[PDB]
Amino acid sequence: RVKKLINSQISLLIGKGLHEFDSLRDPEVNDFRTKMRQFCEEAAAHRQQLGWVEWLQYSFPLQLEPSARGNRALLVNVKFEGSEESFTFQVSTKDMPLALMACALRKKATVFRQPLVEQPEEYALQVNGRHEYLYGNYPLCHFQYICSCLHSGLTPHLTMVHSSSILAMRDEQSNPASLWSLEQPFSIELIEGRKVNADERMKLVVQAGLFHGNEMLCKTVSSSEVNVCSEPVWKQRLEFDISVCDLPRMARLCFALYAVVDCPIAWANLMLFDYKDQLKTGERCLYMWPSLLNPAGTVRGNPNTESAAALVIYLPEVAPHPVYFPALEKILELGRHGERRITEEEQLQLREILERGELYEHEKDLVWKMRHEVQEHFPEALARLLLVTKWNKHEDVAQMLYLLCSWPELPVLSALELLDFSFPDCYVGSFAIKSLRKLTDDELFQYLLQLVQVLKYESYLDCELTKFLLGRALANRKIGHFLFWHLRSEMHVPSVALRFGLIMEAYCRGSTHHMKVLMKQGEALSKLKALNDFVKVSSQKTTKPQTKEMMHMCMRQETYMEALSHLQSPLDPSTLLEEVCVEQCTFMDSKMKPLWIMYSSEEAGSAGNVGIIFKNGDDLRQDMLTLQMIQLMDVLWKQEGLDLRMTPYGCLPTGDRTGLIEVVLHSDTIANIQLNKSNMATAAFNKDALLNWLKSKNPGEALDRAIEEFTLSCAGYCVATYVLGIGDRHSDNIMIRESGQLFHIDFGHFLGNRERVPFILTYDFVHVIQQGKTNNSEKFERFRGYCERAYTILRRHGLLFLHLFALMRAAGLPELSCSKDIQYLKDSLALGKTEEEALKHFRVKFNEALRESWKTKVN
Numbered sequence: 029r030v031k032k033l034i035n036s037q038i039s040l041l042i043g044k045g046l047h048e049f050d051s052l053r054d055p056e057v058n059d060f061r062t063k064m065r066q067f068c069e070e071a072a073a074h075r076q077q078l079g080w081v082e083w084l085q086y087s088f089p090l091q092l093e094p095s096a097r098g099n100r101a102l103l104v105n106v107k108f109e110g111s112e113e114s115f116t117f118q119v120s121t122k123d124m125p126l127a128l129m130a131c132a133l134r135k136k137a138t139v140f141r142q143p144l145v146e147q148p149e150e151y152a153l154q155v156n157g158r159h160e161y162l163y164g165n166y167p168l169c170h171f172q173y174i175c176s177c178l179h180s181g182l183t184p185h186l187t188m189v190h191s192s193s194i195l196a197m198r199d200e201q202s203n204p205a206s207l208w209s210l211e212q213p214f215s216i217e218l219i220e221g222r223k224v225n226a227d228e229r230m231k232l233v234v235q236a237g238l239f240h241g242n243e244m245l246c247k248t249v250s251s252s253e254v255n256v257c258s259e260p261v262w263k264q265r266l267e268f269d270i271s272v273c274d275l276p277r278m279a280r281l282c283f284a285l286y287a288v289v290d291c292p293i294a295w296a297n298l299m300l301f302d303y304k305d306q307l308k309t310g311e312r313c314l315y316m317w318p319s320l321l322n323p324a325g326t327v328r329g330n331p332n333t334e335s336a337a338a339l340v341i342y343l344p345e346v347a348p349h350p351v352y353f354p355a356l357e358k359i360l361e362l363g364r365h366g367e368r369r370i371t372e373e374e375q376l377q378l379r380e381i382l383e384r385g386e387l388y389e390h391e392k393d394l395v396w397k398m399r400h401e402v403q404e405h406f407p408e409a410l411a412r413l414l415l416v417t418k419w420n421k422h423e424d425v426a427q428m429l430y431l432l433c434s435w436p437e438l439p440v441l442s443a444l445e446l447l448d449f450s451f452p453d454c455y456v457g458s459f460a461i462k463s464l465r466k467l468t469d470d471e472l473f474q475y476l477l478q479l480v481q482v483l484k485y486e487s488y489l490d491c492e493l494t495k496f497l498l499g500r501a502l503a504n505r506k507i508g509h510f511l512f513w514h515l516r517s518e519m520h521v522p523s524v525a526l527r528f529g530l531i532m533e534a535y536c537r538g539s540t541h542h543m544k545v546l547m548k549q550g551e552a553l554s555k556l557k558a559l560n561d562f563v564k565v566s567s568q569k570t571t572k573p574q575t576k577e578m579m580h581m582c583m584r585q586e587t588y589m590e591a592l593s594h595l596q597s598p599l600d601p602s603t604l605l606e607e608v609c610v611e612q613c614t615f616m617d618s619k620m621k622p623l624w625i626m627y628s629s630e631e632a633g634s635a636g637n638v639g640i641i642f643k644n645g646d647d648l649r650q651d652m653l654t655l656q657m658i659q660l661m662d663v664l665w666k667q668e669g670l671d672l673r674m675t676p677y678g679c680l681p682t683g684d685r686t687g688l689i690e691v692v693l694h695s696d697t698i699a700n701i702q703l704n705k706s707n708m709a710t711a712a713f714n715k716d717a718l719l720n721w722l723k724s725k726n727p728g729e730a731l732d733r734a735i736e737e738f739t740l741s742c743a744g745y746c747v748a749t750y751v752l753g754i755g756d757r758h759s760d761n762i763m764i765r766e767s768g769q770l771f772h773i774d775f776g777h778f779l780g781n782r783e784r785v786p787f788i789l790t791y792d793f794v795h796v797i798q799q800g801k802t803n804n805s806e807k808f809e810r811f812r813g814y815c816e817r818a819y820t821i822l823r824r825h826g827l828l829f830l831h832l833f834a835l836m837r838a839a840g841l842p843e844l845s846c847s848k849d850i851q852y853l854k855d856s857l858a859l860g861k862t863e864e865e866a867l868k869h870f871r872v873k874f875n876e877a878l879r880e881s882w883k884t885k886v887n
């Protein structure tokens with residue numbers, strides 16, 4: 029009764045009926061579902077018995093300041109859960125939550141004239157009207173919430189929540205109750221093709237290659253030219269220059285059907301061994317993807333069989349019995365035997381190339397020969413060694429694996445490199461995952477987007493990365509929340525819909541309660557899509573105030589009021605979207621008419637006043653990636669004591685060309701501010717407009733802080749947009765907060781898009797930095813130091829950006845497709861240079877931007 033209901037809820041939530049999984053009659057799919065359902069149910073059972081503080085860590089993970097990861101007076105308002113009464117008292121930013129709780133309990137004991145049985149140790153502090161809590165031994169300023177309150181001048185509002193109330197939360201959210209002997213050359217039979225569409229004047233060719241990730245295992249082989257028709261017949265043997273015994277475990281056979289007089293038509297790939305390590309034999313009908321060879325492409329066929337071109341091949345029965353890939357112990361027994369001492373002049377050449385990339389043929393022979401010295405004295409150079417390993421020789425792969433199986437754990441930075449498609453071996457991926465287990469939940473969340481993209485490179489459904497991601501998502505509700513949405517937003521992509529659908533179902537088995545919370549979000553998103561469609565049509569016939577009044581009426585319907593109210597925000601599960609403020613809702617006049625949905629919450633006070641933007645028609649993945657990169661910059665800067673007052677607002681794709689963007693309230697575009705309308709708080713010179721607007725928002729002594737906020741954030745965005753190559757910057761996509769913080773929006777073009785984006789300096793912004801003065805080198809040169817400091821901090825982490833962007837090539841974003849896009853980051857970060865050379869080059873670029881800025885000052 030309940031299992032049937034849950035299955036129907038999973039189907040609606042993931043956007044694909046579970047019956048469709050069953051209908052594939054696919055053993056691999058069935059074994060994934062069984063194994064992962066069991067793995068996720070164990071996680072759920074472990075969670076239901078967690079202690080009350082451990083359950084707060086699961087459900088409300090701490091939001092700490094980046095500097096606090098791994099003195100001053102403060103007013104705080106504290107209430108108790110079943111109370112309207114509140115106590116405002118002064119604490120120190122260095123006090124711990126326990127002291128604040130003990131203080132609140134003394135105030136409650138004297139007001140209620142009774143000495144209390146409850147100890148401060150029995151409570152946690154909830155941020156009012158948010159799924160956010162303050163707990164643990166950390167000073168108040170170490171929490172992101174208190175730190176945020178400190179800068180914005182607002183008073184923290186906290187609610188004392190008792191352990192029994194937290195346990196009541198935990199309880200109501202419960203789940204219900206031998207190859208190496210086969211020396212023959214590898215070969216296949218190209219039988220025939222189906223549903224082929226091509227120019228009848230041309231001829232058809234099938235090119236085939238053997239790959240181990242990016243590297244070709246042997247030379248490619250082509251079929252003979254056969255006349256173009258819908259059902260081509262070849263019925264010919266294709267033989268490769270590699271012995272069957274040497275095919276590595278992760279070998280893939282890649283096809284490309286094209287037309288010749290070049291006209292690409294289709295591609296299809298497959299793993300030579302199955303998920304149970306057995307070499308494949310018999311016929312295979314390969315349903316091809318429309319387009320020369322595509323090795324990174326998926327190894328599962330095109331699901332649109334009704335119209336996909338197919339390629340029938342035959343994998344020969346190389347043995348009278350099934351052949352399985354050797355078990356690890358047999359590989360290790362073979363690799364155990366090898367040879368290790370060569371010249372100090374050869375040793376010195378190894379230290380130069382390992383601390384240097386690309387290298388010559390003789391240097392590969394030197395790195396391979398000294399592989400034991402690589403393991404012992406340069407363990408972090410494992411990736412260079414794996415690249416020199418000849419993956420087409422089964423005995424060199426066995427020696428690489430013997431060293432790998434005793435390789436010391438590498439740092440997270442090194443592991444993120446190893447997840448790249450250039451390291452397709454399963455043991456290498458397993459080693460990379462083992463070195464990633466030490467990632468904190470905060471580091472994991474920072475890199476989650478890249479780890480999800482790595483799933484598209486996985487050759488098999490059940491893998492160490494999926495289990496690692498599912499285990500982390502079930503142990504942290506915020507990780508779980510975003511893993512769900514990163515997968516859900518790609519269900520319209522046929523190449524990932526099965527893998528992603530299966531991960532989402534398995535996660536759902538682990539948290540029935542969270543599945544229901546996510547349904548409530550999908551219901552709101554469903555209604556927002558209908559509302560945006562209504563707005564796009566109505567905006568073409570009537571005026572903006574009429575379409576807005578019609579939008580409000582459609583929102584005031586009972587179905588909309590229920591669907592859109594009392595939900596956790598997809599942008600941030602800590603943010604509660606309570607009462608939709610229909611009157612404050614609106615839409616932008618851009619082509620897709622994005623909706624601006626406003627919310628309030630009595631419980632949360634001013635912090636419950638939040639906005640979300642529903643956007644349908646544009647792809648939001650590039651915006652999300654850019655905004656995550658700016659947030660990563662902000663974390664790296666704050667880790668060095670540098671706060672550039674950045675505004676990395678939320679952006680989350682949720683569906684096909686659909687997603688949400690977090691509203692930053694009290695913000696306006698530079699264009700609106702520069703409109704210089706009359707009867708407002710009105711410049712003599714348009715250059716005075718931003719500064720006058722800052723003055724009206726920050727009177728008296730507050731102007732100085734607003735100018736400083738502007739300066740810091742301007743330096744941060746100047747460096748961020750330059751490093752990332754964000755172009756097409758104009759007054760309509762640069763915003764300013766009433767606090768003075770400048771920020772950028774609308775990141776549809778990055779990494780040059782394809783020119784080399786120069787460093788930018790705007791006169792109107794220089795004018796604010798210079799406090800409205802023509803000459804103010806004191807304030808201007810403080811700003812130049814903020815820029816150089818920010819830039820030099822990012823260069824020190826250049827490899828982190830490079831590794832993350834390399835993992836993102838799997839996303840298929842058009843402006844991040846090849847090594848040419850990664851080159852842009854190398855050039856902007858000047859990674860081939862020393863710090864002095866790169867600082868000299870940054871100074872030349874900043875000075876160039878100043879002379880260009882002066883072409884406006886001169887006018």
Ligand SMILES: COc1ncc(N2CCOCC2)cc1S(=O)(=O)Nc1ccnc(-c2ccc(CN3CCN(C(C)C)CC3)cc2F)c1
Binds near residue numbers: 614700760
């Ligand atoms: C990529 O899209 C976005 N990215 C970030 C934001 N961000 C918007 C700000 O928060 C961060 C995200 C918003 C959008 S969008 O989808 O709304 N598209 C664009 C495009 C150009 N310009 C804008 C704009 C134009 C004018 C204004 C000025 N505000 C004044 C205050 N009202 C309220 C009182 C209703 C709204 C208009 C803002 C714009 F964004 C909005």
